[PDB]
Design a protein around this nucleic acid. Structure first.
Lengths: 51, 520
DNA sequence: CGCTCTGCTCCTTCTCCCATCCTCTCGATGGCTATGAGATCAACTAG
DNA sequence: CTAGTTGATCTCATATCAGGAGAAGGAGCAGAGCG
């Protein structure tokens, strides 16, 4: 379960740079590796790579 | 008539029109039909893969082989350019079949599903495109097709594309691929093609990679240990043996004496980057963006696009008589000017290809700037105007040069009218430029043709050239012969951002064969 | 007479917790993740 | 009606040290039935 935006608000700094929450960065890592694992299982990858 | 094993009689007049190799093909296709297996017609383009299908299906219908009384409803999936070409071909080489086109152009002018039903009931030959296959996997895969020919079937080379899955939803065993190059980048493409034609032969995709792609690839690298070279050699031979029955690949050397093609040439020209071109390239390689890409902070593709553009023309930045797309601003355009000058003086028809589409526009405005009468043909040119454009260019010699994007420019069009071919822009895919250059040197090309590959020395394009060479060697190692020489020129790393301009078997035959393979 | 099934010890992980509230300053970090060709389709635009 | 044009809009392709306390598990082992 990925929480809503209220639990991880993207606070705007003095300028326009929108800083993301720690939860959002972590979910970014999770989605990155999840997509990476999904393609590695779908396409050519070694068993140790998938592991 | 000509007669084969069980009941296959193909009409004699039709047979006599064929060549010896095309006759072999027809026999091969029928043997597959007997096995109920599929195959890849990997004949080199211009040999006429389509003619063989016409003959075989004609013979099958005529023989009335016994669910189906001869030839049932069948679907042809071919690239959008060539649909009417196939219709024309069926119509001439065998009028009796009904060949319905499934397209916006089409000829039906009602709902399409009615047409699908009509063909599936009256047993026609439904031609369609890969898109309409992707978009009506539901409708189309409800009608017990008898044959599922895919022309230029390499488009199914991605096992996960939607079109691939849609094509692999068809149920009949009589699946055929007509693909001049059934392997273009790596064997994953091969597995995909075999999994359409013959779903189990090469195993699952993971297992295929594990067992074949990894070893065969590792044997190509320059630094590979000899042990690994020999594992690659073994695996490559196993693969050829596995795929031998189901791939009929006649190159244009085992038929040349029996077919009499003209001379072919493959010159390469290492173009030199002009001053402004050099400056923009030298700056952008030194730019922070390239440095960040080297650090892996974002996608590499952006950098590669930028570099290719720079080498292709300074269209990163535009600089009277210095308007956008000015020839003198970029060296390759200077070379093209000289070549088209000499060739126009030779009264010769040229065929200029470009991987890009907007660059095809800059080439177009150039050819306006010159007095060269051209005809341009890319993805934006209407499909209905496509085959008539090809026919027009082939019928008269008034049209001198023929701008082409390689993606529609390749893929089954016949362009025998042109004589000289120049590949202006490299690709990461060797097959693209190969089919491009092969548009001319086909059956019916009654005049000599030479191929010029224009390349920028020391820039990205040379490294892309190295990529497509390494790919070509990998394809050769598994299609033409596994004794390929190792690609020693480069280590093929991410240092391609630099500018370095010039200046019964009786169980002893078996065991002997086994010992041979396992000695490697 | 060896096999089991306790159940005691001892260690060893292993986890958790560490007053309230309030004021100020100061330093760091605060990113996109790209491109283009071809095909469909539906909107107009002209004929 | 019919080509032609034009946006979207999709798909596909390209690359490599001054903590402490308590609770849970495991291991070793004495010993007691017991078959």
């Amino acid at each position: 379960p990925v929480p809503p935006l209220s639990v991880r608000p993207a606070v705007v700094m003095q300028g326009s740079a929108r800083n993301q929450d720690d939860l959002t960065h972590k979910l970014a890592d999770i989605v990155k590796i999840n997509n990476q694992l999904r393609r590695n299982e779908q396409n050519g990858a070694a068993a140790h790579v998938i592991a | 008539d000509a007669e084969f094993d069980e009941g296959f009689k193909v009409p004699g007049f039709l047979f006599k029109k064929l060549f010896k190799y095309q006759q072999t093909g027809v026999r091969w296709l029928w043997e597959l039909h007997c096995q109920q297996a599929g195959g890849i017609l990997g004949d080199e383009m211009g040999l006429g893969r389509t003619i063989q299908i016409i003959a075989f299906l004609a013979g099958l219908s005529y023989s009335k082989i016994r669910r189906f009384e001869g030839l049932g409803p069948t679907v042809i999936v071919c690239p959008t350019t060539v649909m009417h070409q196939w219709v024309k071909e069926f119509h001439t080489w065998w009028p009796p079949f009904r060949v319905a086109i499934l397209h916006e152009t089409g000829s039906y002018t009602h709902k399409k599903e009615k047409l699908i039903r009509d063909v599936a009931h009256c047993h026609g030959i439904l031609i369609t495109s890969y898109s309409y296959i992707r978009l009506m996997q539901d409708d189309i895969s409800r009608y017990d097709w008898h044959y599922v020919i895919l022309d230029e079937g390499h488009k199914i080379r991605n096992p996960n594309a939607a079109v691939t899955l849609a094509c692999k939803q068809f149920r009949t065993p009589h699946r055929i691929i007509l693909s001049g190059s059934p392997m273009q980048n790596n064997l994953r493409e091969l597995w995909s093609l075999f999994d359409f034609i013959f779903p189990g032969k090469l195993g699952t995709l993971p297992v295929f990679m594990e067992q074949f792609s990894v070893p065969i690839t590792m044997g190509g690298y320059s630094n590979a240990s000899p042990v690994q070279v020999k594992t690659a050699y073994k695996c490559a031979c196993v693969l050829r043996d596995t795929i031998n029955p189901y791939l009929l690949r006649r190159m244009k050397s085992d038929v040349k004496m029996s077919l009499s093609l003209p001379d072919k040439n493959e010159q390469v020209l290492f173009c030199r980057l002009t001053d402004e071109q050099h400056k923009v390239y030298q700056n952008f390689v030194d730019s922070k963006e390239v440095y960040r890409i080297l650090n892996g902070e974002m996608q590499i593709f952006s950098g590669l696009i930028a570099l290719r553009k720079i080498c292709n023309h300074p269209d990163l930045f535009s600089g009277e008589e210095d308007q956008f797309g000015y020839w003198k601003r970029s060296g390759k355009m200077i070379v093209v000017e000289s070549l088209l000058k000499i060739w126009h003086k030779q009264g010769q028809r040229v065929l200029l290809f470009s991987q890009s589409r907007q660059m095809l526009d800059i080439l177009e405005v150039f050819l306006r700037a010159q007095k060269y009468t051209y005809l341009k043909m890319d993805g934006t040119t209407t499909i209905a105007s496509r085959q008539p454009l090809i026919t027009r260019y082939n019928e008269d010699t008034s049209i001198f040069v023929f701008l082409l994007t390689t993606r529609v420019g390749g893929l089954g069009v016949n362009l025998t009218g042109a004589n000289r071919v120049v590949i202006y822009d490299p690709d990461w895919n060797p097959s693209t430029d190969t089919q491009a250059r092969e548009r001319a040197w086909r059956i019916g090309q009654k005049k000599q043709v030479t191929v010029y590959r224009l390349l920028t020395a020391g820039t990205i394009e040379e490294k892309i050239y190295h990529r497509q060479i390494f790919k070509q060697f990998l394809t050769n190692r598994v299609l033409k012969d596994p004794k390929q020489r190792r690609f020693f020129k480069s280590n093929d790393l991410y240092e391609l951002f630099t500018l370095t301009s010039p200046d019964p078997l009786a169980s002893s035959s078996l065991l002997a064969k086994m010992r041979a393979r396992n000695h490697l």
